[PDB]
A paper describes a structure:
To establish if the selective effect of Ca2+ on ADP binding to BiP is reflected in the structure of the complex, we purified the NBDs of mammalian BiP, Hsp70, and Hsc70 and co-crystallised them with Ca2+ and ADP. In each case, additional density in the nucleotide-binding cleft indicated occupancy by ADP and the overall conformations of the three NBDs were very similar. Overlay of the BiP(NBD) structure with the Hsp70(NBD) and Hsc70(NBD) structures revealed root-mean-squared deviations (RMSD) of 0.769 Å and 0.734 Å over the Cα alignment, respectively. Moreover, in each structure, Ca2+ was identified in the nucleotide- binding cleft, where it formed contacts to both phosphate groups (α and β) of the nucleotide as well as indirect contacts to protein residues via several water molecules (inset). The NBD structures also revealed a second, surface-exposed Ca2+ ion that is coordinated by the carboxyl group of D257 and backbone carbonyl of H252 in BiP and homologous residues in the cytosolic Hsp70s. Ca2+ binding to this second site is likely an experimental artefact favoured by the high [Ca2+] in the crystallisation solution and crystal packing. The highly similar CaADP binding mode does not explain the stronger effect of Ca2+ on BiP function compared to the other Hsp70s. However, the IC50 values for Ca2+-dependent inhibition of MABA-ADP release from the NBDs of Hsp70 (444.7 ± 80.5 µM) and Hsc70 (345.5 ± 71.1 µM) were much higher than from the NBD of BiP (57.1 ± 7.4 µM). Given that concentrations of Ca2+ in the cytoplasm are in the nanomolar range, these results imply that the effect of Ca2+ on ADP binding to cytoplasmic Hsp70s has limited physiological relevance. Importantly, the stabilising effect of Ca2+ was greatest for mammalian and Drosophila BiP(NBD), compared to the cytosolic Hsp70(NBD)s.
Author numbering: 4 to 188, 192 to 381
Write the structure that this text describes.
């Protein structure tokens, strides 16, 4: 029986299996090679992944996400108290431990972060089992390099609740390096990891297969969703101009526009323009418009440039110059943005980016390789 590698990401998760010298990144029931880190509770069902995220506009109070921001933290942790303002779902205190409180089948229920994450891991486990055709019992799960003992244990506990023997908890940047075979080489590797909600820069030194985390930098609240937000605000103003109506206080309309903006953003990574066509956005008014890559880049120019500041800090903390970095590794779904690739490459004076592996799959890819080694 094959062991699996799971990237348990802030906003998306990804599962891979290493068989016959190569990694299969496993598509879910909807054909998606990543799955939202989302759990929704309704009057009749518990939804996980695509089904959960797809009804977020309908059911905001009972659609749980960002469990990774809570996992292994105390309720009184300043990060928890600060983050609670970003969430439409209720977080309560159960003996200095945070629980997400929701309505499920007409009853008030509360879940520990590792319980929510266990449901995401169960989905990823089931996705792998559908592909392999037998039950999976062994997994490597990845965490950020800066995760403490509490956050690592809570992540492992999520795995155990999901019915997995957790072979090892390994660092996300290390998994990304393993995906590119950089573990087999001192080599200095910079991991540039821009996801949906978080930006992580890591400098690893690899010496005879041994990894040392020399520096970690970034922004725990900078991600692709910030770029979506810049598009949302742009189109809210456009709708005001054309229809003399403010949609900003209609939560459903804003969430539906946000979904359309995220889809348009993805198109702008491969095309120089994208069409944004929403039926009945507000008071039965259809919103059919477009966005150029250039305008998108203008709207996010400051946010894109800000990604180089943690790169500068990481190099300074690692006591390394640009030329002393041997390999640049692009990971996280947001690194598909051409302007982000340009900024990093230009900063490193034309150096190649390791980007041949789907950036939102590289961490799961490496986890799958390491899972097979440990088996
Ligand atoms: N082609 C693309 N162009 C731009 N952004 C993309 C593209 N594909 C995915 N993304 C973005 O990647 C982010 C998710 O990154 P991922 O690493 O999968 O998740 P996580 O947030 O869990 O780290 C989202 O903001 C999504 O919009
Ligand atoms: Ca943000
Ligand atoms: Ca990611």
């Amino acid at each position: 029986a094959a062991a699996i590698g799971i990237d348990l990401g802030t906003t998306y998760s990804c599962v891979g299996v290493f068989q016959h010298g190569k990694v299969e990144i496993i598509a879910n029931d909807q054909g998606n090679r990543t799955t939202p880190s989302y759990v929704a509770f309704t009057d009749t069902e518990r939804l996980i992944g695509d089904a959960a995220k797809n009804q977020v506009a309908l059911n905001p109070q009972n659609t749980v996400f960002d469990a990774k921001r809570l996992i292994g933290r105390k309720f009184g942790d300043p990060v928890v108290q600060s983050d609670m303002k970003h969430w439409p779902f209720q977080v309560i205190n159960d003996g200095d431990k945070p629980k997400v409180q929701v309505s499920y089948k007409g009853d008030t229920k509360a879940f520990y972060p590792e319980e929510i994450s266990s449901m995401v891991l169960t989905k990823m486990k089931e996705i792998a089992e559908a592909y392999l055709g037998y039950p999976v019992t062994n997994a490597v799960i990845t965490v950020p390099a800066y995760f403490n003992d509490s956050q690592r244990q809570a992540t492992k506990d999520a795995g155990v609740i999901a019915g997995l023997n957790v072979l090892r908890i390994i660092n996300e940047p290390t998994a990304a390096a393993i995906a590119y075979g950089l573990d087999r080489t001192e080599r200095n590797v910079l991991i540039f990891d821009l996801g949906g909600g978080t930006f992580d820069v890591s400098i690893l030194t690899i010496d005879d297969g041994i990894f040392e985390v020399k520096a970690t930098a970034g922004d725990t609240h900078l991600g692709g969703e910030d770029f979506d937000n810049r598009l949302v605000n742009h189109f809210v103003e456009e709708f005001k101009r054309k229809h003399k109506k403010d949609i900003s206080q209609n939560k459903r309309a804003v969430r539906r526009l946000r979904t359309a903006c995220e889809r348009a953003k993805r198109t702008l990574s491969s095309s120089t323009q994208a069409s944004l066509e929403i039926d009945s956005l507000f008071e039965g008014i259809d919103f059919y418009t477009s966005i150029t890559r250039a305008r998108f880049e203008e709207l996010c120019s400051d946010l894109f440039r800000s990604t180089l500041e943690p790169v500068e800090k990481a190099l300074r903390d690692a006591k390394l110059d640009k030329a002393q970095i041997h390999d640049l590794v692009l990971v996280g779904g947001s690194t598909r943005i051409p302007k982000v690739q340009k900024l990093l490459q230009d900063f490193f004076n034309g150096r190649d980016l390791n980007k041949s592996i789907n950036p939102d799959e590289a961490v799961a890819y490496g986890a799958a390789v390491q899972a097979a080694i440990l088996m």
